[PDB]
């Protein structure tokens, strides 16, 4: 894989937020006597795989066609561990388990699968002193976030260094291969234990392709405005406010609180800034000397995700602007810019005070020993030989 | 890369057609010390690339969005030599030359490019003892087939062993990568110098394209059964835009003109090496031909929704069979019926015997190498 080097890179405390990098070549081949370029990076097959050998790929699903999910699976590079994080209907979940098993079996690779609403996991969490995801029903709430949270836990338990997420509503397995390799590419270019990689795909000049465009644009702005509010300079750096397909080294993943809804992606960035932007004093000694790199990689393969959702669009916007409005870094100027976008579209007339998004605190607080203690008689269930 | 094992294999003279194989895993990793076997084919990354280091990948284009073509290029595995065969308008060709030059420089890899209507090549072919694809104007005829012929000449010259084709109307570089890894996957599983790999995929739109290719496939299978004496289901890639072949094979093979290119490749295989007619080629007699058919995980999602061509595609293919020297009266009539049934005059129906260029083997490479001497500069994207 050959990417561009980011021409500029926003600095913000110890966070280093790189400008978008285009991928020029999907597959760079095998390094020998190559002539060094200063404007782009070639990443060697070998090293990409070695990185993927330490990488967990979470595939979250809630009643997604089986064909699709199989498609996605066949597309994940061999070296990565697969975790299906399911929340499907009980029937479908079984079908998913059998699907994974055929797959892991035939391709001689380890995987894990689990279900969001599994009581075993709920007590596991709670024993490890992490009761926050559980609901009135005594089970973990439905929500992609809560699924990811549990996937993070497995990632942690399985000793993988990096976690990446790939959505299962992906028609193109070849795409998935790229996104996953691009994660590994990010982590290679990184020179910090604490790295994040976010995939985007921009569309350059309708119903779906048109008016979702102008919302990510707005969403992206509100992040840049948030940064601007602090540095005292405008910036156009953030282009991945929502980035479903994103990855992070586990060391950083466990450090970040997560939000509940569509708010999840945007929050991560806000969190990073609040935590490591040098404004509030910084506790974490190992981050203060290594810093955080954030990569934004522009993929060669389009994001084609099936749907039939309109009111997901409104919400997406709403959630992003919420996380910014309620940031401890939001200057008075930003807060109002944001509130005006909201009202002037769809949310509370007078009279707006957009719900503060609700935040699970970092997993760094979950005693992993307790969890290991608590699922001993079960780990062979989640595990798919 | 992991694939299914073909669950059967038609033997026809020394030709072996494999039943379709699904790719199960796009990327099987590095086989480093690994316990092999099971009922699938696993192909090591290292072996795959060593094969691509011997592979030319031809990208034909007539007047296609540049952004599409950059895409396609970006998906070709690094090891593979890129040949852009152009027949675009004067203006565009320039832009294409630039595009490629940029890409190859930036990614440090050899490419070549030519225009189908370049006079220098027409002179070269005529020198090579091969005037056949030249039109009246004195320039090479338009049509994809003619482009491929030229690209094969470049392939032979560049001394690569294996030639793959990839159409540029392709929206997903990821798909492109899978195709080219599949071509290598094919050649790796072959136990012969003479191998061929053919890729396929599985409103009221694509219903039209379906029933016709299943009809094109059926036609080819009928060709086979009429000879063997027993019906077969095996040909599923009568049309195969994305295909590859070891070069040794390609130069032995006479090429048809229209949408006859793909079907005719199979028919000529069967006629030359099916054991019916005298087969004299000490090497093919002794090594035989393997044809693979690989079902890809990534959809063929191209730039199209037009119906005039579709009929023509059917007519083309059914003609190649009708006019085969292997067709039986039964096989002939069955074609004629479908072909009238769809679109073709009631009485006087005898679909055009397609026109075929003789094998490229019948060409002197040193002659063309002499003739292109002052010109290699402009073809090679230096
Ligand atoms: N474990 C779990 N998985 C879920 C849940 N709900 C959905 N999923 C699965 O996780 C993915 C969520 O995808 P969608 O339901 O398609 O959400 P979306 O509206 O397409 O939005 C996505 O893309 C955006 C683009 O960057 C993202 O902003 C967003 O977070 C999300 O990933 C899907 O693969 C789905 O099958 C859940 O409650 N729990
Ligand atoms: N060099 C050259 N290229 C051409 C010419 N005409 C078309 N091409 C290019 O070669 C490819 C042929 O694709 P289309 O022109 O889109 O043909 P099609 O009707 O889409 O059919 C394609 O797909 C089918 C899939 O198996 C095939 O059956 C068919 O042969 C062809 O590849 C495209 O990249 C096209 O721009 C030509 O005269 N010369
Ligand atoms: Mg989706
Ligand atoms: Mg086409
Ligand atoms: Zn810049
Ligand atoms: Zn996506
Ligand atoms: Zn069969
Ligand atoms: Zn021999
Ligand atoms: Zn195709």
PDB file of N, CA, C and O in Angstrom, chain B residues 112-159:
ATOM      1  N   UNK B 112       3.269   0.378 -19.994  1.00  0.00           N
ATOM      2  CA  UNK B 112       3.302   0.640 -21.432  1.00  0.00           C
ATOM      3  C   UNK B 112       1.946   1.159 -21.837  1.00  0.00           C
ATOM      4  O   UNK B 112       0.945   0.905 -21.162  1.00  0.00           O
ATOM      5  N   UNK B 113       1.910   1.879 -22.945  1.00  0.00           N
ATOM      6  CA  UNK B 113       0.648   2.366 -23.481  1.00  0.00           C
ATOM      7  C   UNK B 113       0.773   2.566 -24.974  1.00  0.00           C
ATOM      8  O   UNK B 113       1.814   2.984 -25.481  1.00  0.00           O
ATOM      9  N   UNK B 114      -0.290   2.249 -25.679  1.00  0.00           N
ATOM     10  CA  UNK B 114      -0.322   2.463 -27.103  1.00  0.00           C
ATOM     11  C   UNK B 114      -1.712   2.841 -27.546  1.00  0.00           C
ATOM     12  O   UNK B 114      -2.688   2.561 -26.848  1.00  0.00           O
ATOM     13  N   UNK B 115      -1.802   3.485 -28.703  1.00  0.00           N
ATOM     14  CA  UNK B 115      -3.097   3.703 -29.313  1.00  0.00           C
ATOM     15  C   UNK B 115      -3.305   2.753 -30.482  1.00  0.00           C
ATOM     16  O   UNK B 115      -2.433   2.558 -31.326  1.00  0.00           O
ATOM     17  N   UNK B 116      -4.488   2.165 -30.508  1.00  0.00           N
ATOM     18  CA  UNK B 116      -4.869   1.162 -31.491  1.00  0.00           C
ATOM     19  C   UNK B 116      -4.736   1.664 -32.918  1.00  0.00           C
ATOM     20  O   UNK B 116      -4.506   0.879 -33.836  1.00  0.00           O
ATOM     21  N   UNK B 117      -4.891   2.975 -33.097  1.00  0.00           N
ATOM     22  CA  UNK B 117      -4.863   3.580 -34.422  1.00  0.00           C
ATOM     23  C   UNK B 117      -3.507   4.228 -34.717  1.00  0.00           C
ATOM     24  O   UNK B 117      -3.378   4.967 -35.692  1.00  0.00           O
ATOM     25  N   UNK B 118      -2.510   3.958 -33.868  1.00  0.00           N
ATOM     26  CA  UNK B 118      -1.111   4.377 -34.100  1.00  0.00           C
ATOM     27  C   UNK B 118      -0.560   3.750 -35.390  1.00  0.00           C
ATOM     28  O   UNK B 118      -0.487   2.514 -35.486  1.00  0.00           O
ATOM     29  N   UNK B 119      -0.169   4.590 -36.380  1.00  0.00           N
ATOM     30  CA  UNK B 119       0.378   4.092 -37.661  1.00  0.00           C
ATOM     31  C   UNK B 119       1.647   3.234 -37.528  1.00  0.00           C
ATOM     32  O   UNK B 119       1.809   2.271 -38.284  1.00  0.00           O
ATOM     33  N   UNK B 120       2.513   3.565 -36.565  1.00  0.00           N
ATOM     34  CA  UNK B 120       3.778   2.839 -36.339  1.00  0.00           C
ATOM     35  C   UNK B 120       3.612   1.340 -36.074  1.00  0.00           C
ATOM     36  O   UNK B 120       4.454   0.539 -36.503  1.00  0.00           O
ATOM     37  N   UNK B 121       2.540   0.988 -35.357  1.00  0.00           N
ATOM     38  CA  UNK B 121       2.187  -0.406 -35.061  1.00  0.00           C
ATOM     39  C   UNK B 121       1.656  -1.130 -36.302  1.00  0.00           C
ATOM     40  O   UNK B 121       2.050  -2.264 -36.590  1.00  0.00           O
ATOM     41  N   UNK B 122       0.765  -0.477 -37.039  1.00  0.00           N
ATOM     42  CA  UNK B 122       0.282  -1.030 -38.296  1.00  0.00           C
ATOM     43  C   UNK B 122       1.451  -1.396 -39.232  1.00  0.00           C
ATOM     44  O   UNK B 122       1.437  -2.453 -39.871  1.00  0.00           O
ATOM     45  N   UNK B 123       2.468  -0.535 -39.299  1.00  0.00           N
ATOM     46  CA  UNK B 123       3.675  -0.849 -40.063  1.00  0.00           C
ATOM     47  C   UNK B 123       4.370  -2.073 -39.478  1.00  0.00           C
ATOM     48  O   UNK B 123       4.755  -2.988 -40.207  1.00  0.00           O
ATOM     49  N   UNK B 124       4.489  -2.104 -38.156  1.00  0.00           N
ATOM     50  CA  UNK B 124       5.156  -3.206 -37.485  1.00  0.00           C
ATOM     51  C   UNK B 124       4.459  -4.540 -37.753  1.00  0.00           C
ATOM     52  O   UNK B 124       5.104  -5.515 -38.140  1.00  0.00           O
ATOM     53  N   UNK B 125       3.145  -4.577 -37.549  1.00  0.00           N
ATOM     54  CA  UNK B 125       2.375  -5.784 -37.807  1.00  0.00           C
ATOM     55  C   UNK B 125       2.575  -6.236 -39.257  1.00  0.00           C
ATOM     56  O   UNK B 125       2.786  -7.428 -39.513  1.00  0.00           O
ATOM     57  N   UNK B 126       2.540  -5.289 -40.197  1.00  0.00           N
ATOM     58  CA  UNK B 126       2.659  -5.655 -41.602  1.00  0.00           C
ATOM     59  C   UNK B 126       4.024  -6.288 -41.866  1.00  0.00           C
ATOM     60  O   UNK B 126       4.117  -7.254 -42.623  1.00  0.00           O
ATOM     61  N   UNK B 127       5.055  -5.765 -41.202  1.00  0.00           N
ATOM     62  CA  UNK B 127       6.408  -6.324 -41.259  1.00  0.00           C
ATOM     63  C   UNK B 127       6.461  -7.721 -40.647  1.00  0.00           C
ATOM     64  O   UNK B 127       7.094  -8.635 -41.200  1.00  0.00           O
ATOM     65  N   UNK B 128       5.782  -7.873 -39.510  1.00  0.00           N
ATOM     66  CA  UNK B 128       5.752  -9.131 -38.764  1.00  0.00           C
ATOM     67  C   UNK B 128       5.123 -10.294 -39.505  1.00  0.00           C
ATOM     68  O   UNK B 128       5.180 -11.435 -39.047  1.00  0.00           O
ATOM     69  N   UNK B 129       4.532 -10.004 -40.660  1.00  0.00           N
ATOM     70  CA  UNK B 129       3.864 -11.019 -41.453  1.00  0.00           C
ATOM     71  C   UNK B 129       2.426 -11.186 -41.022  1.00  0.00           C
ATOM     72  O   UNK B 129       1.877 -12.289 -41.103  1.00  0.00           O
ATOM     73  N   UNK B 130       1.813 -10.083 -40.581  1.00  0.00           N
ATOM     74  CA  UNK B 130       0.485 -10.120 -39.958  1.00  0.00           C
ATOM     75  C   UNK B 130      -0.398  -8.917 -40.326  1.00  0.00           C
ATOM     76  O   UNK B 130      -0.760  -8.119 -39.456  1.00  0.00           O
ATOM     77  N   UNK B 131      -0.772  -8.791 -41.613  1.00  0.00           N
ATOM     78  CA  UNK B 131      -1.498  -7.593 -42.014  1.00  0.00           C
ATOM     79  C   UNK B 131      -2.942  -7.623 -41.541  1.00  0.00           C
ATOM     80  O   UNK B 131      -3.596  -6.585 -41.489  1.00  0.00           O
ATOM     81  N   UNK B 132      -3.396  -8.816 -41.162  1.00  0.00           N
ATOM     82  CA  UNK B 132      -4.805  -9.149 -40.969  1.00  0.00           C
ATOM     83  C   UNK B 132      -5.693  -8.154 -40.190  1.00  0.00           C
ATOM     84  O   UNK B 132      -6.847  -7.958 -40.570  1.00  0.00           O
ATOM     85  N   UNK B 133      -5.174  -7.523 -39.111  1.00  0.00           N
ATOM     86  CA  UNK B 133      -6.040  -6.600 -38.360  1.00  0.00           C
ATOM     87  C   UNK B 133      -5.993  -5.137 -38.827  1.00  0.00           C
ATOM     88  O   UNK B 133      -6.517  -4.248 -38.149  1.00  0.00           O
ATOM     89  N   UNK B 134      -5.387  -4.903 -39.985  1.00  0.00           N
ATOM     90  CA  UNK B 134      -5.310  -3.567 -40.575  1.00  0.00           C
ATOM     91  C   UNK B 134      -6.516  -3.318 -41.485  1.00  0.00           C
ATOM     92  O   UNK B 134      -6.873  -4.172 -42.300  1.00  0.00           O
ATOM     93  N   UNK B 135      -7.142  -2.151 -41.339  1.00  0.00           N
ATOM     94  CA  UNK B 135      -8.259  -1.756 -42.205  1.00  0.00           C
ATOM     95  C   UNK B 135      -7.829  -1.084 -43.499  1.00  0.00           C
ATOM     96  O   UNK B 135      -6.650  -1.100 -43.862  1.00  0.00           O
ATOM     97  N   UNK B 136      -8.793  -0.484 -44.193  1.00  0.00           N
ATOM     98  CA  UNK B 136      -8.534   0.205 -45.453  1.00  0.00           C
ATOM     99  C   UNK B 136      -7.663   1.444 -45.321  1.00  0.00           C
ATOM    100  O   UNK B 136      -6.697   1.616 -46.075  1.00  0.00           O
ATOM    101  N   UNK B 137      -8.021   2.309 -44.373  1.00  0.00           N
ATOM    102  CA  UNK B 137      -7.274   3.538 -44.102  1.00  0.00           C
ATOM    103  C   UNK B 137      -5.778   3.260 -43.882  1.00  0.00           C
ATOM    104  O   UNK B 137      -4.953   4.178 -43.943  1.00  0.00           O
ATOM    105  N   UNK B 138      -5.449   1.986 -43.646  1.00  0.00           N
ATOM    106  CA  UNK B 138      -4.076   1.555 -43.409  1.00  0.00           C
ATOM    107  C   UNK B 138      -3.766   1.474 -41.926  1.00  0.00           C
ATOM    108  O   UNK B 138      -2.640   1.169 -41.538  1.00  0.00           O
ATOM    109  N   UNK B 139      -4.776   1.745 -41.100  1.00  0.00           N
ATOM    110  CA  UNK B 139      -4.666   1.640 -39.644  1.00  0.00           C
ATOM    111  C   UNK B 139      -5.464   0.447 -39.074  1.00  0.00           C
ATOM    112  O   UNK B 139      -6.415  -0.049 -39.683  1.00  0.00           O
ATOM    113  N   UNK B 140      -5.073  -0.003 -37.889  1.00  0.00           N
ATOM    114  CA  UNK B 140      -5.714  -1.151 -37.277  1.00  0.00           C
ATOM    115  C   UNK B 140      -7.179  -0.843 -37.024  1.00  0.00           C
ATOM    116  O   UNK B 140      -7.514   0.231 -36.535  1.00  0.00           O
ATOM    117  N   UNK B 141      -8.045  -1.782 -37.382  1.00  0.00           N
ATOM    118  CA  UNK B 141      -9.475  -1.678 -37.101  1.00  0.00           C
ATOM    119  C   UNK B 141      -9.753  -1.438 -35.627  1.00  0.00           C
ATOM    120  O   UNK B 141      -9.017  -1.936 -34.772  1.00  0.00           O
ATOM    121  N   UNK B 142     -10.827  -0.695 -35.346  1.00  0.00           N
ATOM    122  CA  UNK B 142     -11.379  -0.546 -33.988  1.00  0.00           C
ATOM    123  C   UNK B 142     -12.073  -1.837 -33.546  1.00  0.00           C
ATOM    124  O   UNK B 142     -12.381  -2.695 -34.377  1.00  0.00           O
ATOM    125  N   UNK B 143     -12.343  -1.948 -32.244  1.00  0.00           N
ATOM    126  CA  UNK B 143     -12.902  -3.164 -31.641  1.00  0.00           C
ATOM    127  C   UNK B 143     -11.949  -3.633 -30.561  1.00  0.00           C
ATOM    128  O   UNK B 143     -10.731  -3.499 -30.708  1.00  0.00           O
ATOM    129  N   UNK B 144     -12.485  -4.171 -29.471  1.00  0.00           N
ATOM    130  CA  UNK B 144     -11.643  -4.556 -28.329  1.00  0.00           C
ATOM    131  C   UNK B 144     -10.636  -5.639 -28.716  1.00  0.00           C
ATOM    132  O   UNK B 144      -9.473  -5.582 -28.306  1.00  0.00           O
ATOM    133  N   UNK B 145     -11.086  -6.603 -29.523  1.00  0.00           N
ATOM    134  CA  UNK B 145     -10.272  -7.769 -29.887  1.00  0.00           C
ATOM    135  C   UNK B 145      -8.942  -7.365 -30.478  1.00  0.00           C
ATOM    136  O   UNK B 145      -7.875  -7.874 -30.071  1.00  0.00           O
ATOM    137  N   UNK B 146      -9.046  -6.453 -31.449  1.00  0.00           N
ATOM    138  CA  UNK B 146      -7.922  -5.858 -32.150  1.00  0.00           C
ATOM    139  C   UNK B 146      -6.956  -5.187 -31.183  1.00  0.00           C
ATOM    140  O   UNK B 146      -5.741  -5.315 -31.332  1.00  0.00           O
ATOM    141  N   UNK B 147      -7.497  -4.488 -30.187  1.00  0.00           N
ATOM    142  CA  UNK B 147      -6.677  -3.948 -29.107  1.00  0.00           C
ATOM    143  C   UNK B 147      -5.909  -5.035 -28.363  1.00  0.00           C
ATOM    144  O   UNK B 147      -4.691  -4.923 -28.127  1.00  0.00           O
ATOM    145  N   UNK B 148      -6.613  -6.101 -27.992  1.00  0.00           N
ATOM    146  CA  UNK B 148      -5.944  -7.190 -27.296  1.00  0.00           C
ATOM    147  C   UNK B 148      -4.817  -7.787 -28.167  1.00  0.00           C
ATOM    148  O   UNK B 148      -3.702  -8.025 -27.696  1.00  0.00           O
ATOM    149  N   UNK B 149      -5.091  -8.004 -29.446  1.00  0.00           N
ATOM    150  CA  UNK B 149      -4.059  -8.549 -30.310  1.00  0.00           C
ATOM    151  C   UNK B 149      -2.766  -7.755 -30.135  1.00  0.00           C
ATOM    152  O   UNK B 149      -1.721  -8.319 -29.783  1.00  0.00           O
ATOM    153  N   UNK B 150      -2.858  -6.445 -30.337  1.00  0.00           N
ATOM    154  CA  UNK B 150      -1.720  -5.552 -30.148  1.00  0.00           C
ATOM    155  C   UNK B 150      -1.095  -5.688 -28.766  1.00  0.00           C
ATOM    156  O   UNK B 150       0.131  -5.742 -28.648  1.00  0.00           O
ATOM    157  N   UNK B 151      -1.935  -5.766 -27.731  1.00  0.00           N
ATOM    158  CA  UNK B 151      -1.429  -5.872 -26.358  1.00  0.00           C
ATOM    159  C   UNK B 151      -0.654  -7.164 -26.147  1.00  0.00           C
ATOM    160  O   UNK B 151       0.337  -7.179 -25.425  1.00  0.00           O
ATOM    161  N   UNK B 152      -1.107  -8.239 -26.789  1.00  0.00           N
ATOM    162  CA  UNK B 152      -0.385  -9.513 -26.777  1.00  0.00           C
ATOM    163  C   UNK B 152       1.009  -9.349 -27.407  1.00  0.00           C
ATOM    164  O   UNK B 152       2.013  -9.865 -26.890  1.00  0.00           O
ATOM    165  N   UNK B 153       1.088  -8.606 -28.507  1.00  0.00           N
ATOM    166  CA  UNK B 153       2.403  -8.346 -29.074  1.00  0.00           C
ATOM    167  C   UNK B 153       3.297  -7.674 -28.028  1.00  0.00           C
ATOM    168  O   UNK B 153       4.435  -8.085 -27.806  1.00  0.00           O
ATOM    169  N   UNK B 154       2.766  -6.677 -27.341  1.00  0.00           N
ATOM    170  CA  UNK B 154       3.576  -6.029 -26.333  1.00  0.00           C
ATOM    171  C   UNK B 154       3.952  -6.975 -25.225  1.00  0.00           C
ATOM    172  O   UNK B 154       5.028  -6.840 -24.636  1.00  0.00           O
ATOM    173  N   UNK B 155       3.057  -7.929 -24.963  1.00  0.00           N
ATOM    174  CA  UNK B 155       3.193  -8.865 -23.859  1.00  0.00           C
ATOM    175  C   UNK B 155       4.374  -9.748 -24.173  1.00  0.00           C
ATOM    176  O   UNK B 155       5.346  -9.788 -23.412  1.00  0.00           O
ATOM    177  N   UNK B 156       4.294 -10.420 -25.324  1.00  0.00           N
ATOM    178  CA  UNK B 156       5.384 -11.231 -25.849  1.00  0.00           C
ATOM    179  C   UNK B 156       6.732 -10.494 -25.762  1.00  0.00           C
ATOM    180  O   UNK B 156       7.731 -11.077 -25.342  1.00  0.00           O
ATOM    181  N   UNK B 157       6.736  -9.209 -26.132  1.00  0.00           N
ATOM    182  CA  UNK B 157       7.962  -8.409 -26.242  1.00  0.00           C
ATOM    183  C   UNK B 157       8.589  -8.113 -24.911  1.00  0.00           C
ATOM    184  O   UNK B 157       9.817  -8.060 -24.776  1.00  0.00           O
ATOM    185  N   UNK B 158       7.727  -7.932 -23.924  1.00  0.00           N
ATOM    186  CA  UNK B 158       8.146  -7.536 -22.605  1.00  0.00           C
ATOM    187  C   UNK B 158       8.627  -8.762 -21.855  1.00  0.00           C
ATOM    188  O   UNK B 158       9.138  -8.659 -20.733  1.00  0.00           O
ATOM    189  N   UNK B 159       8.421  -9.923 -22.475  1.00  0.00           N
ATOM    190  CA  UNK B 159       8.927 -11.199 -21.969  1.00  0.00           C
ATOM    191  C   UNK B 159       8.260 -11.682 -20.696  1.00  0.00           C
ATOM    192  O   UNK B 159       8.845 -12.420 -19.916  1.00  0.00           O
TER     193      UNK B 159
END
